[PDB]
Write a protein that binds this ligand. Structure first.
Ligand SMILES: *[C@@H]1O[C@H](CO)[C@@H](O[C@@H]2O[C@H](CO)[C@@H](O)[C@H](O)[C@H]2NC(C)=O)[C@H](O)[C@H]1NC(C)=O
Ligand SMILES: COCCN(CCc1ccc(Br)cc1)C1CCN(c2nccs2)CC1
Ligand SMILES: [Br-]
Ligand SMILES: [Br-]
Length: 358
């Protein structure tokens, strides 16, 4: 089984024990660690943070004692230009420039592959996205024909049915990618103005859910139905939770809200909490496991957060193995309890143990 784990460079700037650098990562925890994110500048792949070369080194050092560990560099994100990615994929000139720039950059900085995290191609760039993936794979094939270990090509794909329908040609890009990480979190499941778990495993109670596609099971089944081999499918599991400010004494799935939850001390973003922030939050809170959805939420005062814990990620790993998928993907290592402030990496270690069947 694959255990694909993301590291985010901006996590270095977090205060106190939130500060996360690649040397805090257990070199044996994951089979693949993906560094997020790299830039596209002048139609070339390039660094993003000022100390990216150094952090690259800290990350790829981890393979010294661990030769099986593979690393990829992720390009894209949600604070990208996105028009830039479309320009590179649509403009043939920019496309050849980017594709040619990638293998030497990766070899120079010690990465074993590239990860595409374009969010999102859209209706206009579905075909350009397919072309980009095909020609990227072709250049990787050419670069290593003289008996070199071939560069890997992966892609993080949305788990949202609408985005999947408008953005991806699944059966075509699946034959070129080494694996597909399906982002089975950030689901916009709940009715508007209402609490909902952002990463439920199953639909759960039928009349308590606005639609059928806003759950992990549906997204995995759909991507399989569209022609993605199970052996190339890596199911994403979040080490973060989605939070809401309650508007009433109702604390269940479906309760009214006035907006996003209060930002955590370390990540400082309304509506989201890192898992260690959630561990701090759990002191004094009540945890209810959503019966049909197999994931927990925790409530305290006017605060509601749907998250994943050790039991729920064990359940999700059992799901992916029953489906015979390639493994699990984790977003993100720096959002797990990496310093063990509440052992270390509790959620990712739970995923890793659960991946070891029986
Ligand atoms: C990522 O790449 C983009 C594209 O080259 C950079 O955008 C330019 O940044 C310079 C410096 O601030 C500006 O003067 C230009 O006007 C920008 N051009 C465009 C088209 O956006 C961006 O700075 C890069 N980011 C990082 C962190 O390296
Ligand atoms: C409002 O946030 C929406 C963006 N979501 C969540 C970001 C977030 C997490 C924790 C905190 Br605390 C604050 C923000 C990301 C999640 C993972 N991501 C990818 N996974 C694989 C490749 S790209 C897609 C977008
Ligand atoms: Br419909
Ligand atoms: Br359907």
């Amino acid at each position: 089984y694959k255990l694909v784990c993301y590291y985010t460079s901006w996590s270095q700037y977090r205060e106190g024990d939130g500060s996360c650098f690649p040397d805090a990562l257990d070199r044996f925890l994951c089979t693949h660690i993906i560094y997020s994110f790299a830039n596209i500048s002048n139609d070339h792949i390039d660094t993003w943070e000022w100390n990216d070369v150094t952090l690259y080194g800290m990350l790829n050092t981890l393979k010294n004692r661990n030769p099986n560990l593979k690393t990829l560099l992720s390009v894209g994100g949600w604070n990208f230009g996105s028009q830039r990615f479309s320009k590179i994929a649509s403009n043939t000139q920019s496309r050849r420039t980017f594709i040619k720039s990638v293998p030497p950059f990766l070899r120079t900085h010690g990465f074993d592959g590239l990860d595409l995290a374009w969010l999102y191609p859209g209706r206009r760039d579905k075909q350009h996205f397919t072309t980009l993936i095909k020609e990227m794979k072709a250049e990787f094939i050419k670069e290593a024909q003289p008996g070199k270990k071939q560069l890997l090509l992966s892609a993080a794909l949305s788990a949202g049915k609408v985005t999947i329908d408008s953005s991806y040609d699944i059966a075509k890009i699946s034959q070129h990618l080494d694996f597909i990480s399906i982002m089975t979190y950030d689901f916009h499941g709940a009715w508007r103005g209402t609490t909902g778990h952002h990463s439920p495993l199953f639909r759960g109670q039928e009349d308590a859910s606005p639609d059928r596609f806003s759950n992990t099971d549906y997204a995995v089944g759909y991507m399989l139905r569209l022609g993605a081999p199970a052996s190339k499918l890596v199911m994403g599991i979040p080490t973060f939770g989605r939070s809401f400010t309650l508007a009433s004494s109702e604390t269940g799935v479906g309760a009214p809200i006035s907006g996003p939850g209060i930002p955590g001390r370390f990540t400082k973003e309304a509506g989201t909490l890192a898992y260690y922030e959630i561990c701090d939050f759990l002191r004094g809170a009540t945890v209810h496991r959503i019966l049909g959805q197999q994931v927990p939420y925790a409530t305290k005062g006017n605060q509601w957060v749907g998250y994943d814990d050790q039991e729920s990620v064990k359940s999700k790993v059992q799901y992916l193995k029953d489906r015979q998928l390639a493994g699990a993907m984790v977003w993100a290592l720096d959002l797990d309890d990496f310093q063990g402030s509440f052992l270390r990496f509790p959620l990712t270690n739970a995923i890793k143990d659960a991946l070891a069947a029986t």
